[PDB]
Paper text:
StnA is an essential enzyme in the Streptonigrin biosynthesis pathway. The crystal structure shows that StnA has an α-helical cap domain positioned atop a common α/β hydrolase domain. The data clearly shows that Ser185-Asp308-His349 constitutes the catalytic triad of StnA.
The selenomethionine substituted StnA (SeMet-StnA) was crystallized in the space group C2 with four molecules per asymmetric unit. The structure of the enzyme was determined by single-wavelength anomalous dispersion (SAD) phasing method and refined to 2.71 Å with an Rfactor of 0.1923 and Rfree of 0.2196. The final model of StnA consists of residues 61–375 because of the poor electron density for the 60 residues at the N-terminal region. Residue Thr77 in each monomer is in the cis conformation. StnA is stabilized by two additional disulfide bonds of Cys61/Cys64 and Cys312/Cys319, which are located between β1 and β2 and between β7 and αD, respectively. The catalytic His349, located in the loop between β8 and helix αF, points towards the nucleophile, with its Nε2 atom at a distance of 3.2 Å from the Oγ atom of Ser185. The His349 Nδ1 atom forms a hydrogen bond/salt bridge with Oδ1 (3.2 Å) and Oδ2 (2.7 Å) of Asp308, located between strand β7 and helix αE. The overall structures of the free and complex are very similar with a RMSD of 0.232 Å over 316 Cα atoms.
Numbering used by the authors: 61 to 380
Write the structure that this text describes.
């Protein structure tokens, strides 16, 4: 049971700045040299990476602390407790530069006081695109965790989200937070089960908690050619882990992302990660888009932890 402090970070936004909310946690009675920064995907916020239902099972953040890593989870601008600007001011490039400012903040100690020797950047859905752009542009991270985002997507899956899209102003969870402009969307109540989790077995408590902790996105970001541009990923020169669910409705399918086997998936993605000194791949069985939220999520947590231990470590070991 971990020691945590929330803050806001001033971050570049258009001509001026905006506020990004984040939470820094350390394991209790320790001070790690590695911090893992986690970037959520579209229609999520920080809750995805620190899930408040059965956290000993579903909280990735908590698992990391328990493994001796420091963690920093953020609400992206437009979401959560962060600034909600006009949507025209937000795009992936802008958001990547904001993450770059968070990474620097963590390295220098401006965020969290201690300063961190190693910084791992972890992403999910379009969070992974932000993560990739950041690492590709600024080269100031020691490793990169890419989840739920491949270079081929399933257009029918994409289109299915759009069919279940709606303004946060007509959504019961988000109605009363802000008057959102026309560039914001979220998902229809009850739809996430299908369009994200592919109706695969999940705890009802998880589905409900996910629906209650959902959020808005700036939807034009999904159409940004940078999401799948090979120039972004091929330029990344630190260790990469790539994780994907074998029932992921947004990626997987005949002629799209190859979820037939872990090896086949690696073979298909490898050409896109040519500067990476290592490229690890995990294909999670019976899992849709949300890897943190599935019943067999521990397999994925364990593989991620093992990878971190192998490739950066946490700064508390005595090992060789």
């Amino acid at each position: 049971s971990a020691i945590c402090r929330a803050t806001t970070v001033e971050v570049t936004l258009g001509k001026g700045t905006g506020k990004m909310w984040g939470e820094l946690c350390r394991p209790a009675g320790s001070s790690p040299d590695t911090v893992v920064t986690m970037v959520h995907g579209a229609t999520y916020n920080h809750n995805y990476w620190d899930f408040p239902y059965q956290p000993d099972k579903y909280s990735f953040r908590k698992m990391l602390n328990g493994a001796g890593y420091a963690t920093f989870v953020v609400d992206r601008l437009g979401t959560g407790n962060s600034t909600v600007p006009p949507s025209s001011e937000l795009n992936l490039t802008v958001e990547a530069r904001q993450m770059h400012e968070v990474v620097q903040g963590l390295r220098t100690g401006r965020i969290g006081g201690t300063g961190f020797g190693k910084v791992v950047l972890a992403g999910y859905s379009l969070g992974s695109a932000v993560t990739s752009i950041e690492a590709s542009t600024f080269h100031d991270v020691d490793a990169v965790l890419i989840t739920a985002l491949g270079h081929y997507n399933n257009p029918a899956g994409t289109q299915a989200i759009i069919d279940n899209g709606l303004s946060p102003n007509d959504d019961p969870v988000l109605k009363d937070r802000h008057h959102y402009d026309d560039g914001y969307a979220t998902t229809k109540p009850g739809s996430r089960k299908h369009v994200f989790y592919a109706d695969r077995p999940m705890d009802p408590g998880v589905l409900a908690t996910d629906e209650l902790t959902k959020d808005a996105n700036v939807f034009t970001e999904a159409a940004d050619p940078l999401v799948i541009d090979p120039a972004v990923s091929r330029a990344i020169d630190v260790p990469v882990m790539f994780a994907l669910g074998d029932r992921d409705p947004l990626m997987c399918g005949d002629g799209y992302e190859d979820c037939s086997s872990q090896a086949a998936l690696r073979a298909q993605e490898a050409p896109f990660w040519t500067s990476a000194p290592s490229f690890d791949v995990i294909l999670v069985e019976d899992a849709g888009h949300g890897l943190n939220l599935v019943p067999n999520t521990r397999v994925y947590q364990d593989a991620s932890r093992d990878w971190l231990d192998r490739v950066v470590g946490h700064g508390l070991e005595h090992h060789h």
